[PDB]
Amino acid sequence: HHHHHHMVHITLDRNTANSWLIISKDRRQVRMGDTHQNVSDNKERFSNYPMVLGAQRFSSGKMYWEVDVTQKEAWDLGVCRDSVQRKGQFSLSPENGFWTIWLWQDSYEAGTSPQTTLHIQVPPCQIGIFVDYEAGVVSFYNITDHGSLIYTFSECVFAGPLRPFFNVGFNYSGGNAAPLKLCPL
Numbered sequence: 001h002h003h004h005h006h007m008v009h010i011t012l013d014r015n016t017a018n019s020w021l022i023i024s025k026d027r028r029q030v031r032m033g034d035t036h037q038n039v040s041d042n043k044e045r046f047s048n049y050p051m052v053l054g055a056q057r058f059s060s061g062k063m064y065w066e067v068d069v070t071q072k073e074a075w076d077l078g079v080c081r082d083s084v085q086r087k088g089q090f091s092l093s094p095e096n097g098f099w100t101i102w103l104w105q106d107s108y109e110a111g112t113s114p115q116t117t118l119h120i121q122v123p124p125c126q127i128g129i130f131v132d133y134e135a136g137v138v139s140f141y142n143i144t145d146h147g148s149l150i151y152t153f154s155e156c157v158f159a160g161p162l163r164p165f166f167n168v169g170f171n172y173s174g175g176n177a178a179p180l181k182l183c184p185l
């Protein structure tokens, strides 16, 4: 792909983070802590899952960023509406305001309803995410495999400002402690 020139500098919004997450000083990396991280609760924090939003809000244009997922067993990545539900149980779907892919139990799936099987021959260490607001497109690229397409959501009905979306996943196995990292331009 040739989307690299729409690169945007994404930073994580502490205030949206699940209370167990640890965000680096530069706001570019996030990982699951072993316990509650000693912050007060607020209506923005994701309660049920280890999720956090980027600070940036997009309502027009073309945006591109990259995320490092090296040695993780489980994660969700993409974009969501600024007004997605924060508390309780919910599914990642466009009906609920999410345009995402994930890794879970050695398979990759797109967050459609119901979910769609992805066909990945080279497990990615870094994912590229492209959003075209006007066209209603969210695309995912395998940076490890020369930028090969993973999945395109088209005819997206964003219905609001968009925010970058992250889930570091649980670490019940002891094999999923590694961080998500926003990769430099």
Ligand SMILES: CC(=O)NCCc1ccccc1C
Residues within 6 Å of the ligand: 034, 035
């Ligand atoms: C997964 C696990 O066993 N967590 C341990 C967290 C804990 C609890 C009580 C005292 C000290 C620690 C580190």
